[PDB]
Enzyme design. Structure first.
Site, mmCIF file in Angstrom:
data_model
loop_
_atom_site.group_PDB
_atom_site.id
_atom_site.type_symbol
_atom_site.label_atom_id
_atom_site.label_comp_id
_atom_site.label_asym_id
_atom_site.label_seq_id
_atom_site.Cartn_x
_atom_site.Cartn_y
_atom_site.Cartn_z
ATOM 1 N N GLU A 11 -24.617 24.013 -71.055
ATOM 2 C CA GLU A 11 -25.660 23.257 -70.456
ATOM 3 C C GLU A 11 -25.668 21.663 -70.596
ATOM 4 O O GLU A 11 -25.955 20.929 -69.970
ATOM 5 C CB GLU A 11 -27.526 23.699 -70.989
ATOM 6 C CG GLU A 11 -27.381 25.050 -70.185
ATOM 7 C CD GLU A 11 -27.562 24.596 -68.469
ATOM 8 O OE1 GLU A 11 -28.052 26.228 -68.530
ATOM 9 O OE2 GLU A 11 -27.482 23.621 -67.987
ATOM 10 N N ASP A 20 -31.156 18.074 -63.304
ATOM 11 C CA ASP A 20 -29.875 18.991 -63.556
ATOM 12 C C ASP A 20 -28.766 19.361 -61.808
ATOM 13 O O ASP A 20 -29.182 18.573 -60.761
ATOM 14 C CB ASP A 20 -30.442 20.474 -63.803
ATOM 15 C CG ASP A 20 -31.195 21.225 -62.427
ATOM 16 O OD1 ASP A 20 -32.172 22.633 -62.745
ATOM 17 O OD2 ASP A 20 -31.634 20.369 -61.138
#
Ligand SMILES: [Cl-]
Ligand SMILES: [Cl-]
Length: 162
Positions: A11, A20
């Site tokens: 991440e 994202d």
């Protein structure tokens, strides 16, 4: 290696609101804020998540706090889900981390949709599960991360992360 170190690799860490891989406002260590196109909706979810007026920026401690909560929530989602729990219970500790990683990324409902893969995982047919896991929007949209997770399921080792 453990689930925390694994998701931190997958991440990253960003301390300001970012989009994202799907274009959704996110912060910290993959903490999704909102799917709404409004940065002000994101800033508001963030202030609510942290309990103070952030203006889109958080500290590292705050990012790690959300991360701890999100990992915990991913584990809880697995154990509460009728399709995910038996698979998780059947798995060794390393492959369990792979399942947590998937739930963290795509949610409990998304992973529970991998019916055939989950069955193959429960049966310990690792090469076959790995082939089926790859036939997914997940794999086609985020191939490098998906390959690392799939390798973890296939081998039961951390080799893809070392
Ligand atoms: Cl939250
Ligand atoms: Cl990727």
């Amino acid at each position: 290696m453990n689930i925390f170190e694994m998701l931190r690799i997958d991440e990253g860490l960003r301390l300001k609101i970012y989009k994202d891989t799907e274009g959704y406002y996110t912060i910290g260590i993959g903490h999704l804020l909102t799917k709404s196109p409004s940065l002000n909706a994101a800033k508001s979810e963030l202030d609510k998540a942290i309990g103070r007026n952030t203006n889109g920026v958080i500290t590292k401690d705050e990012a790690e706090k959300l991360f701890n909560q999100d990992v915990d929530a991913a584990v809880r989602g697995i154990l509460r889900n009728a399709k995910l729990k038996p698979v998780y219970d059947s798995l060794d500790a390393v492959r369990r981390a792979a399942l947590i990683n998937m739930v963290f990324q795509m949610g409990e409902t998304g992973v529970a949709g991998f019916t055939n893969s989950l069955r193959m995982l429960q049966q310990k047919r690792w090469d076959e599960a790995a082939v089926n896991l790859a036939k997914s929007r997940w794999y086609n949209q985020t191939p490098n991360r998906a390959k690392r997770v799939i390798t973890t399921f296939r081998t039961g080792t951390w080799d893809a992360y070392k």
